Every structure is written in C-alpha cells, then in structure tokens.
Amino acid sequence: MYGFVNHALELLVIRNYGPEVWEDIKKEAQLDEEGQFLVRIIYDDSKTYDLVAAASKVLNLNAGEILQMFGKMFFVFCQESGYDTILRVLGSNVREFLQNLDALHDHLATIYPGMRAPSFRCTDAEKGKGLILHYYSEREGLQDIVIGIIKTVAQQIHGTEIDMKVIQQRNEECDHTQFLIEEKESKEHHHHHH
C-alpha cells in the first residue's frame, strides 16, 4: 500500500472520529513506531489490513465499513481541498473515471514515481447492466475501496445510480476477483413524463 492512500486511511480516522481515537488504534495495530505515512515509504499491505482490523475493535466499524467510508471521504476531501485537477482528470465522472484509471497510472506516475501495476478489464455479462470488472490483484479484500469511490462519483456527479458487487473472490480457486456493475440509467433516461 503506497503511502498516499495509507496516509489517507490515517486521515480518515483522525477527521471523522478523532486524533485521540487514531492513536488508540495506532497502538492496537502495533504501528506506534511507524507514523511516517509518506507516499514513498510504501507500507506493507498486511499492515493496512491489520490496521483496519484494529479499527474494527475500537471504532466497532468492520473492515468493509471502513474501506467504503474511505472511498467516500477520499472523493469529498479532494474536492474540498479545491484542487481543480479532480475536475480535469478522470473526466470528473464515473464513466471517464473507470476508463481513465490506467490514464492516471501513467500520468500521475510521471509526477510521483513508483511502480503501479494495473490489471483490470470491463466487460458486461451480456446485459449491459452488469459490467464485469476483472480485478487482478493480490489485495482481494481491498475491494470495498473501489465500491466507496465508484458509486460516489456515479450518483453524486453523473446522477446515475450504479451498484458494484463482488461476484468472484480471488483465492486458490480463482486468481481473479470479479465485480458486477449494475447501472440504472432508467432512473434518468426513462423519465418520459410531463
């Protein structure tokens, strides 16, 4: 886990709960000696999962909850910072966001060096209302992060209600985690009333 999102995780606890609560969890995650949280440090993914596991005790909010509220915070925080860059990159909307993921992979890497491995595909399961996001990554439980970001930019920006559910989990049986995105444009396009 690169220090950017790792520091954003720290940020989540400090802001929404409190700095006092943060240091309590920091004790439990056995990360009392590690408070750098810088982008080039690259914290072990294990330390991130164990961190949220500790937060699941103190906050009582389970990993899935923390990861989703992380995505929510991440979006609103960036826009709150007043960075107009979020309005330019990723088209500032769900559709562009999804397909521009690999775009920031290269574009933002030129500014912040560091190996970023993107392996993902988006093919609908013969329905349209079911984009199968083929997510190839070892952090299978980091799925809720995607959920918390994508749904937020969808209905809040584009006004389109979409839901992403994990239909396949990376394990020994399957090297890939698959998501299904059910987009409801019938909420907007099917308003033939006046």
Ligand X SMILES: O=C(O)CCCCN(CCc1ccccc1OCc1ccc(CCc2ccccc2)cc1)Cc1ccc(C(=O)O)cc1
| Contact residues: ligand X, CB under 6 A | 1-2, 4-5, 39, 101, 108, 112, 114, 116, 118, 137, 139, 142, 146, 149
The verdict on whether residue 194 carries a ligand-binding annotation is no
At closest approach, how far in Å is the CB of 190 from ligand X? 28
Q: Smaller CB distance to ligand X: residue 129 or 139?
A: 139
At closest approach, how far in Å is the CB of 45 from ligand X? 7
Chain residue at closest Cβ approach to ligand X: 137
At closest approach, how far in Å is the CB of 146 from ligand X? 4
Q: Smaller CB distance to ligand X: residue 27 or 84?
A: 84
Structure tokens at 94: 């769900």
At closest approach, how far in Å is the CB of 12 from ligand X? 14
Q: Smaller CB distance to ligand X: residue 115 or 126?
A: 115
3-state secondary structure the chain: CCHHHHHHHHHHHHHHCCHHHHHHHHHHCCCCCCCCCCCCCCCCHHHHHHHHHHHHHHCCCCHHHHHHHHHHHHHHHHHHCCCCHHHHHHHHCHHHHHHCHHHHHHHCCCCCCCCCCCCEEEEECCCCCCEEEEECCCCHHHHHHHHHHHHHHHHHHHCCEEEEEEEECCCCCCCCEEEEEEEEHHHCCCCCCC
Q: Smaller CB distance to ligand X: residue 22 or 75?
A: 75
At closest approach, how far in Å is the CB of 188 from ligand X? 23
Q: Smaller CB distance to ligand X: residue 15 or 40?
A: 40
Output the known binding site for heme: 105
Q: Which residues are annotated as a binding site?
A: 105
